[PDB]
Symmetry: D2
């Protein structure tokens, strides 16, 4: 309770699934939140469902849109005051092996999953350093930042990139006393409406050969580790990977 | 607040430093706690300093003492009811390279840092499985579970052993639906009275070439990640390593 | 001697430093080699310096040039017969933190270090699978695929991407019995004419806090592990990282 | 050919499987070899099968026997001159979860798999440093040094211990210019007479969910990476893990 007292958080892709759960728990712990998403209909409903405009608002944004990042920080500071906390959560998938990835598919996925995270991390350091905010950048990765999947080649590339790029940012911020931490969160399989819309997906993901716990996670599993990383409880954690995966990567 | 509602925790080496901070925050989040330590004088004072006997008690124990583990679980269940949570934190150091480690030094350190953690983990699974406790075993490791230190050879052996042994235990508990999670916590350098007693230690540990943040941590840095791992907030985390190290292993 | 009997190798950035040493040892072990580089003057001299056109030729190419990859495979097959072996070695550096990386710098580095490796890996799988060649793709990474450097943000992103993308490719090739292995090689600091051209670089790289061996490597250090990975000696190695770094990542 | 010119190698557990293949290829590359094993009948036959006493001899030894290590180094130096190369390969298995490991089973396995490797590594550094031998200690681990197996708890503990202890030894040797490298080798599943003696073992180990290549390795797969690590080709590799596992740990 009040674990994020005074924090101001941007959560990209915060209108659905993991991002929406992070936003919900952030508001419940006293943070002011700006969620982003592609679609006004979904985004405005999502913000209203979590709380009042004094607590949480929506900003329509594609994380691949570099100029839009400036507008997003400006809109969040106008609404809530200086941003302390960024969750780079917006991401897309391509179900292709490296062999069967088109260059179009490659560039489209990296635009969101890599460029978008770079744009958010770079602007976050610039805008949140040296302000005594206890600033925290949480770069959403996944188990595919650690292990290959033969049918997620570009996705693997993006998650490995974010994993190590985040360590570079963590070290530079630490060495320069910027009061900015950077960490990655690595969900395993998480049940969402999108997973429910794919027949057989949850059962395949719940197989003991994939998830040892024999079931998949829920969005709040990722929200709770994000509360810890956004909070001043984690003031000595930077450049670290936090895995919440039901044992996927342990075997 | 009340993040450990109804939990019953054993914390080995809970009378000093990191263990004492874990015990303090566990009680503050509603857990009943049994702390262990070698010395009655230090242990009874430590327990009283955190709370009343209804909240926290001391049990004199060497974690290398196999039979004493049975007495410890029995004393904790008698005091507080069935144990839900074990923090294997008790550990010792030898300041020797592998080359310069005596066999006596090797066996003494592994007795506490490896055998003790095995004894606690094995008994914990046996006593806490299949009871709907949301049981959690937190095996304290360190950055020396990831990276070598040329002057901590036996210590490195013990921390690597606990790191991978914990994944074995996590997987077996998950695959068998034991309702027991096993994770490791990897502190970097943490300021304690013991570190304060070693002239020059903190400044050497705070060098940017060791800890990028340019200072060392405090015991509460490790207490807060332990609250998360003991709590049902981390119900999808098992077989994972949680690093809190000021950037030590990121470079 | 004759460890690469009958192999046909493409080595990108094979006209200088590590790439040139890989080409030299590949020819010395009986492989036919096509080296690539940006500049005809350097490339033709480099090829002639290693051997005769029956052994090694130069092909002018920017690894970021997607269409040029088709011309490169075609030129190599025309010269030497079907390609068995690809070393994605071509790479560039930007000396910027994430904070201080321009979008132009970001895209230029990823074009070579990530897109180029994707283009080479994808085409390599397509052209070398199911031909009984004992095909091997060696994706050059570095220690910056494992650990951050605060002043190599985009470089870190590229090396992490290649590290995990290579595991995806390895798994897909293995599961489909393509007779194609994919592995990454991670040099630490290596002495080259380019390093010699930067005053103070070698001494800074040789500091015990960077390279425990107290000196940097030489190009043949990377050539020898590449001979092993190109050879049928490594027929059970796929999806693996091979580090040759003087202890950099061990501490 | 002659890749181990002038090298003198001790290979523990060198009378069977992986150890015997390492010994065979070491002799074929010009090394003088002392193989160890528990049983004179198997050991003398094994040595004779590889070569003449001028090339390879047997020394009866339990790697858990500390005093016997002194006799082994002395017997090898008497036969072949100063030892340059140690392969700590001797190891045993217990098929138990952590939960179901007896203390007797725990101590018996750690005596060979951990104490034995410590005893060999410590004595190796002492006896091989500062002699211009290009000395190399190769500590045999396995995939169980990286990932848990729910039914190999003590085995996991031993392999994690050796993995990180080896990095400590590597760093100390590097920082002190001892001319001793220490690395670990991590086989996946390897076909041996012992595996052939267990009905169904190879097919279970060859399942795509275990080994992506859909078959297990052969002893020469581990011999070839050991030749590289014993040779001066790997003079810049220390403190590194070398995985040869058919993709096991890549997924
Ligand atoms: Mg390091
Ligand atoms: Mg795995």
């Amino acid at each position: 309770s009040n674990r994020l007292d005074g924090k101001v958080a941007i959560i990209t892709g915060g209108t659905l699934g993991i991002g929406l759960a992070i936003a919900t728990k952030f508001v419940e712990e006293g943070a002011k939140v700006m969620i982003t998403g592609r679609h006004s209909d979904v985004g405005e409903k999502a913000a209203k469902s979590v709380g009042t405009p004094d607590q949480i608002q929506f900003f329509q944004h594609d994380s691949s849109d570099e100029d839009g990042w400036t507008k997003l920080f400006d809109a969040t500071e106008k609404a809530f005051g200086p941003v302390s906390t960024l969750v780079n959560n917006a991401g897309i998938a391509v179900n292709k092996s490296v062999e069967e990835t088109t260059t179009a598919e490659w560039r489209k996925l990296l635009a969101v999953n890599l460029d978008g995270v770079f744009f958010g991390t770079r602007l976050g350091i610039q805008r949140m350093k040296n302000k005594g905010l206890g600033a925290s950048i949480i770069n959403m990765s996944s188990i595919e930042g650690f292990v290959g999947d033969p049918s997620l080649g570009a996705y693997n590339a993006s998650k490995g990139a974010v994993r190590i790029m985040s360590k570079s940012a963590a070290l530079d911020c630490a060495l320069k006393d910027y009061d900015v931490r950077v960490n990655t969160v690595h969900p395993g399989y998480i049940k969402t409406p999108l997973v429910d819309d794919l027949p057989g997906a949850e059962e395949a993901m719940s197989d003991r050969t994939k998830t040892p716990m024999g079931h998949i996670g829920e969005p709040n599993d990722i929200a709770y580790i994000c509360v810890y990383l956004a909070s001043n409880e984690s003031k000595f954690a930077t450049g670290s990977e936090f895995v919440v995966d039901g044992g996927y990567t342990a075997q």
